[PDB]
Amino acid sequence: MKPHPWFFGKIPRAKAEEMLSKQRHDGAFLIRESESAPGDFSLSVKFGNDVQHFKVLRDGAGKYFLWVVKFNSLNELVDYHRSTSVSRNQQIFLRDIEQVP
Ligand SMILES: CNC(=O)C[C@@H](Cc1ccc(OP(=O)(O)O)cc1)C(=O)N[C@@H](CCC(N)=O)C(=O)N[C@@H](CC(N)=O)C(N)=O
Ligand SMILES: [Cl-]
Ligand SMILES: [Cl-]
Ligand SMILES: [Cl-]
Ligand SMILES: [Mg+2]
């Protein structure tokens, strides 16, 4: 149907921070392909004047997770975290970034 506005591919950790620092709302995020760990994904989220980074972990079957609950896709991981916090220190819910039209 429509492509996801959150997949940025191989953008540096620093480029994710540059982009997200311009976003107004907390929870504004992106999924990127890690450069420090090739083959692994990373989640970058906006919170205040900072950008929090999370590593997308894998189990033995290749399922994705951030903490405990695991999923069959990055798509389901992202969607679950729109209603359950990505952080254990703050209530940060994932919301789509405000794109340059
Ligand atoms: C300053 N340390 C970090 O940024 C590492 C970060 C996880 C992390 C580690 C490496 C990394 O490399 P790259 O950006 O892809 O090149 C990206 C993210 C973390 O610990 N994130 C925190 C959550 C955000 C924060 N409080 O700064 C955490 O507890 N993460 C959990 C859960 C997770 N899945 O990341 C963990 N470390 O297992
Ligand atoms: Cl914005
Ligand atoms: Cl690590
Ligand atoms: Cl929650
Ligand atoms: Mg979806």
Q: In sequence order, what are the beta bridge partners of 33?
A: 41
Triad 22, 17, 71: Cα angle to 5°: 110
72: left (phi over 0), alpha (psi -120 to 50) or beta: alpha
Question: Ligand 2 being an ion, which residues bring their Cβ within 5 A of it?
Answer: 23-24, 98
Q: Which atom of ligand 1 is nearest to the CA of 66?
A: 34
The C-alpha atoms of residue 15 and residue 64 are separated, in whole angstroms, by 24
What ligand is nearest to the CA atom of residue 21?
2
Report d(CA 92, CA 41) in Å as an integer: 19
The experimental method behind these coordinates is X-ray
Q: What's the resolution in A?
A: 2.0
- Which residue's CA is minimally distant from atom 31 of ligand 1? 54
Q: Which DSSP helix (H) or strand (E) runs through 46?
A: strand 41-47
Q: Which residue among 33, 46, 54 has the greatest number of ligand 1 atoms within 8 angstroms of its CB, and so is best to mutate?
A: 54
**Residue written as token pair 């953008």:** 11
Tokens 């990373």 belong to which residue? Answer: 42
CA distance 99 to 82: 18
If you take atom 2 of ligand 1, which residue's CA is the nearest one? Answer: 53
Evaluate: CB of 58 within 6 angstroms of ligand 1: no
Q: Is 36 in the pocket of ligand 1 (CB under 6 A)?
A: yes
Q: What element of type H or E holds 74?
A: helix 74-80
Question: Which structural domains are found in the chain, ordered by start?
Answer: 1-101 (3.30.505.10)
